[PDB]
Amino acid sequence: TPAFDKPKVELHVHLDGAIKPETILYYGKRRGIALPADTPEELQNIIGMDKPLTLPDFLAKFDYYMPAIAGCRDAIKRIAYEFVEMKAKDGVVYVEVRYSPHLLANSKVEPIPWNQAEGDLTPDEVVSLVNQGLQEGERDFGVKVRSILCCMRHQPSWSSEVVELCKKYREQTVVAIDLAGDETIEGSSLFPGHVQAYAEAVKSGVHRTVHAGEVGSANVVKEAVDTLKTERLGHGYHTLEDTTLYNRLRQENMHFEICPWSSYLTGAWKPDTEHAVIRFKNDQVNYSLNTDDPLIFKSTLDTDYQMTKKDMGFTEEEFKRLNINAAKSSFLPEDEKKELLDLLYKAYR
Ligand SMILES: NC(=O)c1cn([C@@H](CO)CCc2ccccc2)cn1
Numbered sequence: 001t002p003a004f005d006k007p008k009v010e011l012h013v014h015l016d017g018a019i020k021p022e023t024i025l026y027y028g029k030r031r032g033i034a035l036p037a038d039t040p041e042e043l044q045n046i047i048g049m050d051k052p053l054t055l056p057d058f059l060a061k062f063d064y065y066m067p068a069i070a071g072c073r074d075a076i077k078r079i080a081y082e083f084v085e086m087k088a089k090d091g092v093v094y095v096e097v098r099y100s101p102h103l104l105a106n107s108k109v110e111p112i113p114w115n116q117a118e119g120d121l122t123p124d125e126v127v128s129l130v131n132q133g134l135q136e137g138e139r140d141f142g143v144k145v146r147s148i149l150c151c152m153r154h155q156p157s158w159s160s161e162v163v164e165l166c167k168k169y170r171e172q173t174v175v176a177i178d179l180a181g182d183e184t185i186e187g188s189s190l191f192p193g194h195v196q197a198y199a200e201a202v203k204s205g206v207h208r209t210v211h212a213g214e215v216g217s218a219n220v221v222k223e224a225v226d227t228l229k230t231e232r233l234g235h236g237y238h239t240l241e242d243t244t245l246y247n248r249l250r251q252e253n254m255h256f257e258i259c260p261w262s263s264y265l266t267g268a269w270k271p272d273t274e275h276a277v278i279r280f281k282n283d284q285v286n287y288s289l290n291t292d293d294p295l296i297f298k299s300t301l302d303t304d305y306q307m308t309k310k311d312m313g314f315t316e317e318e319f320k321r322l323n324i325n326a327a328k329s330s331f332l333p334e335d336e337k338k339e340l341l342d343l344l345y346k347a348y349r
């Protein structure tokens, strides 16, 4: 049944949106937090979704569940180990996972997220507990794994902590910075907090990705390329509404992190119109296929590939192409990158 039963590479998936309902339950239960439901299966279809939603409704999902893990050392390391296990069963050989460390913290973080009380788990500790879970995961499951830390659009005052964290934990396992949250906040790409984080990133040799054009206008993409100096785009789909920027981004071979099932579920994509990934396929653009938030979308990687095979004509050949563009556009050291590419070229013939 899998649409593409071969190794893949995944560059766009959020750790906080890729937790096992069973673990949420565990810590919830064990901590007295208080879930909407008390068996694995019920939680899942409560946090899960199958229609487009408001934005408020989407964000509220992270309340149900986040307080159960945030602030808890055990569970922070556990989600990270368990993530890698999950990517094994989808057949991935290399994945970059991303998350905001402030958002699992309950100490030396203002405001404190999710209405937590103040404990003693810091953002910097959060990054080493995820590093541990990810590295012990890699060694047991056979997936090569790096991470990316996210600044958050609405909170530019965390962002220099972000980059400083990327440089502090670099290749152990953090290899890049991202910018995540509400891309429609006016001006948010240019808040000086985020600008100067991404200029430190250029000056320190940290890779950069940014979510832009998933639901913002193409001017948001243009700000991520020209001012934050991004190297890849999260989604990038409204890039098509600006012909000259589209044409220039194909020209320099910009990588687009595409997330098709997520894009229908969130509204980003209207069912009555060509999906932007078909335009990309036909134009030969550099893009990847990715899950975003498997927990919210009740998906695994094969969901994305079954959508595009089924409902869009995608062939094995295209599949192979796109994973090879992923590996080529990953944020690994060049020696490691070429090692990856060898693994896939061999598997693919
Ligand atoms: N799909 C997404 O946009 C997304 C964002 N996150 C995290 C960072 O990885 C933040 C989610 C969040 C929700 C509500 C308030 C603040 C942050 C996870 N998935």
Ligand SMILES: [Zn+2]
Pocket (backbone or CB within 6 Å): 012, 014, 211, 234, 292
């Ligand atoms: Zn995302």
